[PDB]
Structure formats: structure tokens, C-alpha cells
Amino acid sequence: QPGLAELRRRVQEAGVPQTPQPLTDAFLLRFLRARDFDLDLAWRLMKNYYKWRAECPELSADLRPRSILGLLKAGYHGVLRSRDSTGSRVLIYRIAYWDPKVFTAYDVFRVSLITSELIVQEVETQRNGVKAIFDLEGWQVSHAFQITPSVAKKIAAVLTDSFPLKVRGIHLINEPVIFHAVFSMIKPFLTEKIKDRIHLHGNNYKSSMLQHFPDILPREYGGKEFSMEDICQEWTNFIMKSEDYLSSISE
Amino acid sequence: LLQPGLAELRRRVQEAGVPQTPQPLTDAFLLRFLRARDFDLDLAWRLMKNYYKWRAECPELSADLRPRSILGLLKAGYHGVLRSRDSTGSRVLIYRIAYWDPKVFTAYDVFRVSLITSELIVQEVETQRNGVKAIFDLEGWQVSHAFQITPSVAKKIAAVLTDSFPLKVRGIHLINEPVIFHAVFSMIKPFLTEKIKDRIHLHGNNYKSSMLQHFPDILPREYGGKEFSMEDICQEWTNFIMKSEDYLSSISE
Amino acid sequence: QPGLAELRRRVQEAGVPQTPQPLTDAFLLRFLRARDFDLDLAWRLMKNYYKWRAECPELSADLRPRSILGLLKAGYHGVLRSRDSTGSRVLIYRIAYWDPKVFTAYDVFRVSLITSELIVQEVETQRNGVKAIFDLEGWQVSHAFQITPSVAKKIAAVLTDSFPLKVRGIHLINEPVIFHAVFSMIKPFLTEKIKDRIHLHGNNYKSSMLQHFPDILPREYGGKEFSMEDICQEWTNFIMKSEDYLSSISE
Amino acid sequence: PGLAELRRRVQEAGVPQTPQPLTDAFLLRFLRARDFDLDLAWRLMKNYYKWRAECPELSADLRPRSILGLLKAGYHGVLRSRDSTGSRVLIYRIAYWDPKVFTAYDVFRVSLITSELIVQEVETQRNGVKAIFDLEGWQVSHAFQITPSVAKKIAAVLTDSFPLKVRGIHLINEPVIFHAVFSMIKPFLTEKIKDRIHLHGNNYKSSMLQHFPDILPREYGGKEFSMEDICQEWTNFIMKSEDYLSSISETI
Ligand SMILES: CCCC(=O)OC[C@H](COP(=O)(O)O[C@@H]1[C@H](O)[C@H](O)[C@@H](OP(=O)(O)O)[C@H](OP(=O)(O)O)[C@H]1O)OC(=O)CCC
Ligand SMILES: Cc1c(C)c2c(c(C)c1O)CC[C@@](C)(CCC[C@H](C)CCC[C@H](C)CCCC(C)C)O2
Ligand SMILES: Cc1c(C)c2c(c(C)c1O)CC[C@@](C)(CCC[C@H](C)CCC[C@H](C)CCCC(C)C)O2
Ligand SMILES: Cc1c(C)c2c(c(C)c1O)CC[C@@](C)(CCC[C@H](C)CCC[C@H](C)CCCC(C)C)O2
Ligand SMILES: Cc1c(C)c2c(c(C)c1O)CC[C@@](C)(CCC[C@H](C)CCC[C@H](C)CCCC(C)C)O2
DSSP states (O other): OTTTTHHHHHHHTTTOOOSSSOOOHHHHHHHHHTTTTOHHHHHHHHHHHHHHHHHOHHHHSOOOGGGGHHHHHHTOEEEOSSOOTTOOEEEEEEGGGOOTTTSOHHHHHHHHHHHHHHHHTSHHHHHHOEEEEEEOTTOOHHHHHHOOHHHHHHHHHHHSSSSSSOEEEEEEESOOHHHHHHHHHHGGGSOTTTTTSEEEOOSOOHHHHHHHSOSOSOGGGTOSSOOHHHHHHHHHHHHHHTHHHHHHTOO | OOOTTHHHHHHHHHHHTOOOSSSOOOHHHHHHHHHHTTTOHHHHHHHHHHHHHHHHHOHHHHSOOOSGGGHHHHHHTOEEEOSSOOTTSOEEEEEEGGGOOTTTOOHHHHHHHHHHHHHHHTTSHHHHHHOEEEEEEOTTOOHHHHHHSOHHHHHHHHHHHTTOSSSOEEEEEEESOOTHHHHHHHHHGGGSOHHHHTTEEEOOSSOHHHHHHHSTTTSOGGGTOSSOOHHHHHHHHHHHHHHTHHHHHHTOO | OTTHHHHHHHHHHHTOOOSSSOOOHHHHHHHHHHTTTOHHHHHHHHHHHHHHHHHOHHHHSOOOSGGGHHHHHTTOEEEOSSOOTTSOEEEEEEGGGOOTTTSOHHHHHHHHHHHHHHHTTSHHHHHHOEEEEEEOTTOOHHHHHHOOHHHHHHHHHHHHTSSSSOEEEEEEESOOTHHHHHHHHHGGGSOHHHHTTEEEOOSSOHHHHHHHSTTTSOGGGTOSSOOHHHHHHHHHHHHHHTHHHHHHTOO | OHHHHHHHHHHHTTOOOSSSOOOHHHHHHHHHHTTTOHHHHHHHHHHHHHHHHHOHHHHSOOOSGGGHHHHHHTOEEEOSSOOTTSOEEEEEEGGGOOTTTSOHHHHHHHHHHHHHHHTTSHHHHHHOEEEEEEOTTOOHHHHHHOOHHHHHHHHHHHHTSSSSOEEEEEEESOOHHHHHHHHHHGGGSOHHHHTTEEEOOSOOHHHHHHHSTTTSOGGGTOSSOOHHHHHHHHHHHHHHTHHHHHHTSOOO
16 A cells, blocks of 8 residues: 555654554554545544544543443444445434433444444445434434534534544434524535535435435335344444453543 | 495494595405405404505505516516416415516515505405415525515515405415525414414425425426416416506506 | 403403402502503403413413522522612513523523512502513523524513513613624514613623613622622512412412 | 755646746745644645636736726725734725625735735734724625625635735624624634634724734724825835736736
């Protein structure tokens, strides 16, 4: 790979912490692939990733799952069994299974960080990226109370050059009108390729979702072969089985 | 062959001193109000007082009903009326925002097009009985349109729609509407009865099948019909307004 | 009094609820005094009041103060010891002391209903009305989340023709600049007189407020004699002392 | 040092060699704008040329004759003195922008012209600029000119597409709607960036005197000169620079 050992010379001569993430070839590949081996942006992303980590100890330091197990058990999150036509990983998040009384927005954010770290190891996921589907049915004001400006800036960074993962699609379903109306305002001021990656489907999402993701959705969203229950429990399994590797890369 | 409440309405009108010009207080004219409220005399009277109150408060809309000043808008293709009534007998009106040039015409000019049309169709007994449905195609909506809809204009649209014109409004259909219209609808909903809320329909960009449920076999080709085009009915309606200009003069101040 | 006899008769003819608030002459005089003994206006107000009460049982049914005692102890609300120069009762509300995670907009609205039911018993308050000062310092997006269009409609009603108290002044201090844009949207839907009774004073409110309320404000707002904390405590003690009277007029 | 590596990349990447000559002084604008951080300077340089190629209707022509009418009207002046930190201080008056005669692009070109003139000053490269926008007389016709397209260009030029450090943006007499929306945008900006944006409102005299003591025109609190003075002085400087501005413009 053009820049496999080349990039490590920038890593050594800068003084990047060797722990908790061992600076292996397997770890350094994440950053190059995440920018299509553009060595220049790969280095900015690596700096931004560790900058993001040093800025957020309450989030980035701890990847140990046992703390957000209740959320996974409640069925907040599952990853689809298959990749989409572009080979991207497809993730589903379900707002109605987040209890703001029990779990804070930072706990919920950790779930994405955990999943992101496990799937980023997959080569195809590095090349093809991820698409994320947010089912906003069950949105309460108590959820909104949790999304402070500080939380929103962290969502922003992690989706744009602060994590070694291409975001290839953000899909919202069952959003409140208020979400769609505000987004309508910010939409025209966004770049051309970015507003091609954000999709607000509303309540009548059936067919737009099938255009984007044929054959691979759970029954709840128009598919025919499995349910959210299945993939949630499956993904919950994968995370708890990987809890040791997750511990070994924590602080 | 006495009409319920007509004799008494004619007396209340006289005791209150309702303006005799520009529109004469014929039986035909009074009956507009009674029919709009299904012959409930008290409600027809409250309506009739509201109608004159609204007119007096908005003379920059209500005084001049002559079409000449708004001919450009009709020529552009802003407004047409369907040939057929819907299945409940309503007149069906179509307004197309994309043919309103806001550099050229103000919100008040556009509003006058609706007043002119309403004053013409309210002469029909079947329209008095069965009301109107209006379809707004909001494709091509611009910030220039939004800025013309000042809080003042919104109040006069609300005022005129709230018990101030003797036409029953049986349905409002918006198609191709920007998402913000939904937020605006949410803000106004608590001020509406369930009956009225259920008459307002925002269909979105994928409106064709939903709007065909309401208007089978009578829409122009552009909206899923197959017998005529929008252009045909804009021309025909424009024609009719121009032939009615002598009448429209006589009911102007 | 002009119209009391006719009102008594109308009350009887129309089947106005006799419970939980008994239809004494004193109660009927609230409606007459609120409308300067204009019978038709007083009758209209009375009907609007019962209409409002029936539309909003979540607000009107319960005037028991125990559920909102926490808000009163936090220092949300007090009433000035003196009337203003025109004989109006003067109320203070401090948004910083409403925790929207703990109290809903409906709980906060109920505080005003309780206070209003208490002060409307005063003949001078019926004659001279009220002024309310809202200190919006500490306003958060989370206070905004609770002000739905439904709540906005109830607020509008009670300030205009659905509650038998003349509103002689609404003063906002430390209000976010956004309130001015909201005020522009609302103005056409209000008459010249009511718009004239709404005052937004900003962060530098002290001299403009003193023009309206010389000598009577607490120290926090430019007066000299007492603190907000004193008047919150006094008003809390009074609301709780009145708890049986309040229970006696609750459904 | 950092200059040598930048020059290498410039030759390697095929950075356009015209209209502006790629001198050591030209490259130093980019190094100084990012305090000699080579990665940041090179990124800035790349963004600058990218911005020019996407916006040739703005970037190709810096000749001032097309916008002399706007200068003569009193739209724009530069303070005779730098501020206490050495920044160049620019004043824009929306009242004197007739949006029927000049587009937002015309008005934007004035700022491009002023910027290409002051970036030549070493102390300006080092200490950046402050800009004051007097929004008295803001009309709906101005807002119509500010499309999303224009908004994106303004954001780019203020952030990472022009080699001038923006040290402060001051708005005075702004309508409520600027303040209302900005208050919604405020919490999402960084701490450093938020401390560089200042909305003074209608009562601005004291707080403006704080940031710029003894250097402002009479109109904004000073005593030594008028806006009209510095408008005319700046207009005459721009026009005396018209050959220079041609030399850094593409051919016609
Ligand atoms: C300025 C934006 C106004 C706005 O969006 O305002 C909306 C929000 C939420 O308000 P709500 O009272 O919690 O919920 C509303 C009621 O359930 C209503 O009865 C229902 O309509 P219906 O089902 O009876 O027809 C509405 O459905 P939609 O119309 O959304 O689909 C629902 O929204 O408030 C704001 O977010 C407050 C914070 C600013
Ligand atoms: C690397 C990575 C992370 C870390 C990630 C996501 C993706 C696609 C990633 O690639 C998507 C979700 C997110 C940003 C976590 C969001 C946490 C919040 C608390 C979710 C709850 C509610 C939101 C109001 C829902 C809308 C979110 C979308 C607009 C992204 O975390
Ligand atoms: C008697 C009568 C009148 C007078 C009338 C209408 C109807 C159904 C009537 O029966 C509907 C249209 C309206 C209110 C005129 C509207 C004029 C404005 C300027 C149109 C442009 C833009 C609107 C923001 C689009 C949507 C409006 C709907 C929500 C009504 O005039
Ligand atoms: C009889 C009566 C009631 C019942 C009353 C008030 C007055 C003057 C009355 O005379 C004023 C306050 C109000 C309308 C309750 C307000 C409840 C809300 C939830 C307060 C919080 C936030 C408001 C967005 C702050 C601004 C309020 C003013 C614009 C009124 O309750
Ligand atoms: C290199 C450079 C350029 C090129 C520049 C500015 C500055 C400080 C620069 O360093 C400031 C102004 C701007 C961005 C051009 C503005 C053009 C528009 C059409 C002005 C009119 C109206 C604005 C909506 C007023 C407020 C703008 C502030 C929010 C910046 O051009």
C-alpha cells in the first residue's frame, strides 16, 4: 500500500500515544482507506481523530459495553446482516428504545462508538463506508433535553473527518415535522454531495427505503426475511463477545 | 314558497343599515348568506356582519374587483377553474404559485384574483349549496413569495377564511408544498376545529394517487386527469373573468 | 350594581355549573367588574371562562397547590407587596427558577391560575387589574420545547377574554432577541390596546422598568426595600395557607 | 524553511503560474495567514485556487472600473490607522449599496479588491483584518441578493479560502432577524470563533469605542474625520491601483 510504512514515520516523529490503541498496520490502514489513500487527508484525519479523543474523555476513553448493555437489550440498535449494493455497512437506531431517564445521550453516543470500532476493522467497511438509519418514532421532549449544543458538535465532528469511517448515508424515518422544517432551512447552505447523503423519509418511508435498500431490510421497514429483534440480539451478542478486545483498547 | 329566515334577514339588514352599494341587497344576494349557513338565521347574520366588517377593514382588497389590474396574472397561468364539479357538487379551483411573479404582482393582487373568482362563483346556487375546494400547487415557491406573506397578510387570509365570506370551504389541498408549510400547519391547528382540520390536505410531491381519490376523472392531465390541460382551463377561466368585467365593475367601489 | 340581577337570571337560565365554584354574588361581580359593568361583555366573558375551563380540564380542574409547591420553593414566582400607581396587582415570574426537566408548561401555567384565583378575590384587583413581569434571564431552548402551539393558544385565551382579570401590563425583561421576531408575527392578531400593553425591556431594563414601577420593585430590579427571595417566600406561605380554599374550588 | 517545501508542492501540483506570479512574497501570504504551519498554508493555497476556479465570475476580474459607482456612493472605506493589534479595519455600509444597480457579486468584488490590495502589506499578513458592517438601511432587496450560493462563498472567504486572517467581524444596527438567527447559530460555533463575532445593535457607540479607540470616524464615535473622508480616500487608492489590479486579473 502506497504509504503503509511512510505514514508511521509521521506517527513516530510526532509522538502519538502507543496506547490504548496499538499502532499496527491494521490500525493505520483505517485512516488511508478512509480517504482513498490520499496521504495528506489521511494524516489530517489521524490528527483530528486523536484531537477528538483528547477533547472527549467522557466519550472516547471508555469502549467497554457492559455500561450500555441495557440499551442494547432494550433493542435500540442493530446492524443489518448484509451490506447494500455499494458494499456499505448498514446500521439501524431506534429512538423509542432509548429511555432518557435511564440512559444519557453520551451513553447512546457510546453505542455508536463501540459499533464503529468493531466494524471499522472490516476491510470492506473501510472501502465502502456506512449508512445509518434513524427511526425517530417515539421521540419525546426528554430525548431533546439530552441533545445539547455540546452533543451536536460531537455528532458533527464524528460524521466529518474526526473518525476513520466514511459516512455514505444518513436516513431518517418517522421524524417530527419540526426536524424536517429546520433541516429545510439548513439544506440549501450545505454542499452538493452532502445533501445527496442526508435523507428524511417522514412517516411514509416504505418505498423510498426499498429503492435505497432492496432485499436487506427487516420486516418492520419493508423487508421479508428477519426482524429488528433478530439483528438487535445478534449485534448485542457480537459486542458482548468482543467486550475483552473493547476493554483492551480503553483507558 | 317562503325561504326560511329571509324575511327576518331583510329586516335585520335594514335595522343595521347595511351598505346598499356597490352590491344591491336583492333576495339573491341575501340568500348567499343563508345558503352558506344552511338557513340558520343567526349564523347567516353573524356571517353577513363579518363580511362587511372584513371589507371595511381591507378596502385595498375589497373595493376594487375589476380584473384589468390582475390580467397579467391570469394570462401567466396562475388560476383556473375545473369544468366539472367534484362528486359532492363543489366548484374546484386551482392556483399555481409558479405562475405568480412576485417582482410583478404583490400578495394583495394575487388575493384579489381569489376575491374576483369567489364573487363570480357565489352567484351559482349549486356552489352556494355545495361550496368550493381549492387546490394550491406550490411547486416553484420562492423566498420572494414567502416575504410577501407578512404577518399582516396571514391575518387577512385567516380573517377572510374565518366566517367572513359567504362560500362554504369544503376542502383545501396543497401539492408540492415546502416542508415548512407543515410546521406552519402545526402552529395553526390548535386554533381550528377537528371538522376544519380534516378539510386541509397537504399532499407533498408525491401527490398524484392521494389527490386522485378526491377528484377522480376531473383533474387536468398535469395532475393525473386525461381530458384537458391546465392551459385549457386557465384560458377558459381568464376568458370568463374578462366577459364578466362589466359585472365586476358594478360591484366595485 | 349595574347588571348583577340580569346576570343572576342568565346564570340560572343557562345551566352554568354550580360546582366546584359556587355562584355567589361576589363571584358574579368578578365578571361585571372585569368589563366595567357592561352586561353583554361580562356575560360573554363568563361563557368564555366556562368554555375555556371545559376545553382545558388538565389546567382548570385542579387548583390544589401541593403539586407545584416545588416551583414556588425554587423562587419561580412572587407578588409585590404594593400595588402600582394605578392600583394594579404586580406579579413576578422568574424563568431561571423553572426547571423544565421537572415541571411541565402545564404545571407552570397552574401557578398563574392559582395566583389569579387568589388575587381576583380582591375588589381593588378586579377594578385595577394586574401587571405581570417575566424575568427571562436563564431562558433555555428546553423552556421553549414545552411551549407547544396548544400551550400558546391557552396563554392567548387567558390574557384576552377567557379569565375575569383585566391585564393592564405584560413586561418582559432579559428576553432573548428572538422574542422580538415572535412578537412581530403575533401583532396583527392583537388589537391596538393589547399590543400597547406588552413591553419588552431587554438586558438593560432597569430605567425603563422604573418608569412603570417606581418605589415598589425588589432590589434585584432596582427597588431598595426587599429581595425577590422575601417576596417568593411570602407568596409561597400565602398560597399554602389558602390550600383549603383552593381545594374547595377544585374539581 | 517552510517556504522551501511549499514551493516544491507548488511546482509539483501544477499550481497556476498566472495571473499572480508565484514569488516568495506571494507564497509568504499563505504561510503568514496560518503562522508558518505548512500543512495549513498548503491547504489554504489549494482552497484559494479551488475557490477561484469555481467562482471565475468573482475571481477573474479585479479591475475596479465596474464597481467605481459603488465606491463613489459611499459603500466602503478603510480606516487610516490600524487597530491596537495591528489589524487593518474595513467599513461596509449597506445603506449605500443600491441592490437594483449592483448585485451581491458586484459588492463581493469590492471586498476581493480591497483584500488583494491589503494582503500585500506585511503587517496585514501578520495581524489580519477586522471588518465592520453597518446594517442601517438593510432592505428586503438586500436579503434577496444573499442566496445560499452567495452565503457559501462568504463562509469560504472568511474561513479557509483567502490568505487573510479574519480577527473580528463587527455588525452595528443589525435587524432583529440577524440577531435572532445568529443566537441559534451561536451555540454551535467554537469558543475562539464566537469571540470574533460582535453584534453591537442600535446602541453601539460605547462598545465600538472600546474595540477601536481614537481611530473611528465621527459617525461611529471618533472626532478626527468622517466616513465620507475615508470613502473618498479609499476610492482614490483603489483607482490609483487600477493597473496593479489589471495585472492580477485574467485576460479579457
Ligand atoms: C414553530 C414549529 C411549530 C411546531 O412544529 O409545533 C409542533 C411541536 C409539537 O407540538 P405537540 O403539541 O407536542 O404535538 C402536536 C400535537 O400532537 C398535535 O395535536 C398534532 O396534530 P394532530 O395529529 O392532532 O393533527 C401534531 O402533529 P403534526 O402536525 O406535527 O404532524 C403534533 O406536532 O411543538 C413545537 O415543537 C414546540 C417547540 C418549538
Ligand atoms: C463513527 C460514527 C458515529 C460515532 C456515529 C454515527 C456514525 C454514522 C458513525 O460513522 C451515527 C450516530 C452517531 C452520531 C451517534 C448519535 C448519538 C445521538 C445521541 C443519537 C440520538 C438522537 C439523534 C438526534 C438522532 C439523529 C442523528 C443523525 C442526524 C446522525 O454516532
Ligand atoms: C372567499 C375565498 C377567498 C378570498 C380565498 C380562498 C377561498 C378558499 C375562499 O373561499 C383561498 C385563497 C385566498 C385565501 C387567497 C390567498 C392569496 C395568497 C396571496 C395566495 C398565495 C399563497 C398562499 C400562502 C398559498 C396557500 C394558501 C392556502 C393555505 C389557503 O382567498
Ligand atoms: C389569569 C392569568 C393567567 C392564568 C396567566 C397570566 C395572566 C396575566 C393572567 O391574568 C400570565 C401568565 C400565564 C399566561 C401563564 C404563562 C405560562 C407559561 C408556561 C410561562 C412560561 C413561559 C412564557 C412563554 C413566558 C412569557 C409569558 C408572557 C408572554 C405572557 O397565566
Ligand atoms: C477576503 C475577505 C473577503 C473577500 C470578504 C470579507 C473579509 C473580512 C475578507 O477577509 C468581508 C465581506 C465579504 C465576505 C464580502 C461580503 C459580500 C456581501 C454581499 C456583503 C453584504 C451583506 C452581508 C450579508 C453583510 C454581513 C456580512 C458578514 C456576516 C461577514 O468579503
